[PDB]
Enzyme design. Structure first.
Site, PDB file in Angstrom:
ATOM      1  N   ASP A 163       0.846  -1.192   0.000  1.00 14.05           N
ATOM      2  CA  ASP A 163       0.000   0.000   0.000  1.00 14.05           C
ATOM      3  C   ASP A 163       0.883   1.243   0.000  1.00 14.05           C
ATOM      4  O   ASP A 163       1.341   1.680   1.062  1.00 14.05           O
ATOM      5  CB  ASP A 163      -0.880  -0.022   1.238  1.00 14.05           C
ATOM      6  CG  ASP A 163      -1.822   1.146   1.313  1.00 14.05           C
ATOM      7  OD1 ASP A 163      -2.507   1.290   2.362  1.00 14.05           O
ATOM      8  OD2 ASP A 163      -1.911   1.908   0.325  1.00 14.05           O
ATOM      9  N   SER A 195      -0.285  15.396 -12.318  1.00 17.81           N
ATOM     10  CA  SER A 195      -0.498  15.019 -13.698  1.00 17.81           C
ATOM     11  C   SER A 195      -0.724  16.259 -14.547  1.00 17.81           C
ATOM     12  O   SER A 195      -1.253  17.268 -14.084  1.00 17.81           O
ATOM     13  CB  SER A 195      -1.721  14.100 -13.772  1.00 17.81           C
ATOM     14  OG  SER A 195      -2.076  13.798 -15.106  1.00 17.81           O
TER      15      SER A 195
HETATM   16  C1  LIG Z   1      -7.386   0.409   3.902  1.00 21.53           C
HETATM   17  C2  LIG Z   1      -6.060   0.041   3.880  1.00 21.53           C
HETATM   18  N1  LIG Z   1      -5.322   0.904   3.071  1.00 21.53           N
HETATM   19  C3  LIG Z   1      -6.192   1.823   2.606  1.00 21.53           C
HETATM   20  C4  LIG Z   1      -5.942   2.946   1.698  1.00 21.53           C
HETATM   21  C5  LIG Z   1      -4.655   3.764   1.993  1.00 21.53           C
HETATM   22  N2  LIG Z   1      -4.170   3.494   0.595  1.00 21.53           N
HETATM   23  C6  LIG Z   1      -5.336   2.636   0.305  1.00 21.53           C
HETATM   24  N3  LIG Z   1      -7.485   1.553   3.099  1.00 21.53           N
END
Ligand SMILES: c1c[nH]c(C2CNC2)n1
Ligand SMILES: c1c[nH]c(C2CNC2)n1
Length: 330
Positions: free
Chosen positions: A35, A199
């Site tokens: 992430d 962008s």
């Molecule tokens: C739940 C876990 N991670 C996220 C977002 C933060 N980047 C995606 N929501």
């Protein structure tokens, strides 16, 4: 050093991607959601409330000879979709695709919210945003990438997500066989802790490119592409029968439609998202209304270049002293 790990969609829609991660000694392999929009490495564990675990693989620190409780440390995170988790902290050895970090903060969940319990395929998160967002208290902890970066051949990682197919996360090197043409690099602001960039504009289908600055974040942990309402309206206006549905929570379109592509600018370069990448399937099983992969950011406070956008590109997260992002077609 370098690492290289395959990342695999959790379902037929690419709702998220999971990457195997070795934790502890002997290794415990968990499938984590990498992430770039958060900065905590947290896992389902032997400490997680039992009623909140439903099929996930758990980390058991008592079975790891290298695990050490990080005394007094707790963590608690609330994500933009209203999901959350919290717990305590161990340090342990963590390896991704052959790249090993000793002393990594592994945040063990005591509590997770319902949407985590319901994703049986996701055993936790591995945050790759900047460590300034890490939630560990009272001593903030570093991400896996920040801990690894001194040892890496080059202070970079790359995301090469597949469309309805596996892809790759690489650490420490840029695989010049994995993209076409050249990589266009663009400036990053770290002021909000994200891989935040601007962008240079967009086009819908075969339409003319609109030059306009769109500030947003490169977020592998977000499924969809969230952009200003003006841009999103211009996209869906090209799809007969598409509409914004308050009851569903975004733009929907007839599943019988063929969607146009969406192009976004990276400097003078252009990344083309094929129309099929924007189809997220029936809103409910058997429905002929399909959910769109480009949605308005108006309620979010930030534009998000999530997986829909990133999977159309080979993306370099350059963690040099001045970070930058790179995008190539592939
Ligand atoms: C739940 C876990 N991670 C996220 C977002 C933060 N980047 C995606 N929501
Ligand atoms: C990984 C990212 N987001 C999530 C939860 C919150 N929605 C399901 N897991």
């Amino acid at each position: 050093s370098t690492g290289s790990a395959t990342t695999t969609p959790i379902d037929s829609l690419d709702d998220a991607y999971i990457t195997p991660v070795q934790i502890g000694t002997p290794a415990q392999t968990l499938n984590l959601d990498f992430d770039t929009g958060s900065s905590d490495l947290w896992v389902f564990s032997s400490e997680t409330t039992a009623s909140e675990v439903d099929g996930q693989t758990i980390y058991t620190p008592s079975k790891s000879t290298t695990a050490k409780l990080l005394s007094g440390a707790t963590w608690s995170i609330s994500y933009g979709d209203g999901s959350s988790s919290s717990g305590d902290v161990y340090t342990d050895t963590v390896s991704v695709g052959g790249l090993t970090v000793t002393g990594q903060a592994v945040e063990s969940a005591k509590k997770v919210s319902s949407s985590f319990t319901e994703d049986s395929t996701i055993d936790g998160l591995l945050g790759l945003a900047f460590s300034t967002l890490n939630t560990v208290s009272p001593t903030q902890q570093k991400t896996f990438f920040d801990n690894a970066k001194a040892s890496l051949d080059s202070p970079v990682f790359t995301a090469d997500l597949g469309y309805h197919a596996p892809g790759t996360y690489n650490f420490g090197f840029i695989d010049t066989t994995a993209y076409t043409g050249s990589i266009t690099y663009t400036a990053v602001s770290t002021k909000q802790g994200f891989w935040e960039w601007t962008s240079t504009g967009y086009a819908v289908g075969s339409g003319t490119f609109k030059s306009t600055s769109i500030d947003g974040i490169a977020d592998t942990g977000t499924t969809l592409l969230y952009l200003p309402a003006t841009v999103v309206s211009a996209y869906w206006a090209q799809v007969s029968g598409a509409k914004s549905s308050s009851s569903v929570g975004g733009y929907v379109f007839p599943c019988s439609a063929t969607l146009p592509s969406f192009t976004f600018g990276v400097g003078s370069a252009r990344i083309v998202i094929p129309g099929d990448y924007i189809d997220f399937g029936p809103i409910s099983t058997g429905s002929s209304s399909c959910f769109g992969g480009i949605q308005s950011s108006a309620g979010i406070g930030i534009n998000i270049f999530g997986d829909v956008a990133l999977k159309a590109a080979f993306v370099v997260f350059n963690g040099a002293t001045t970070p930058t992002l790179g995008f190539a077609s592939k």
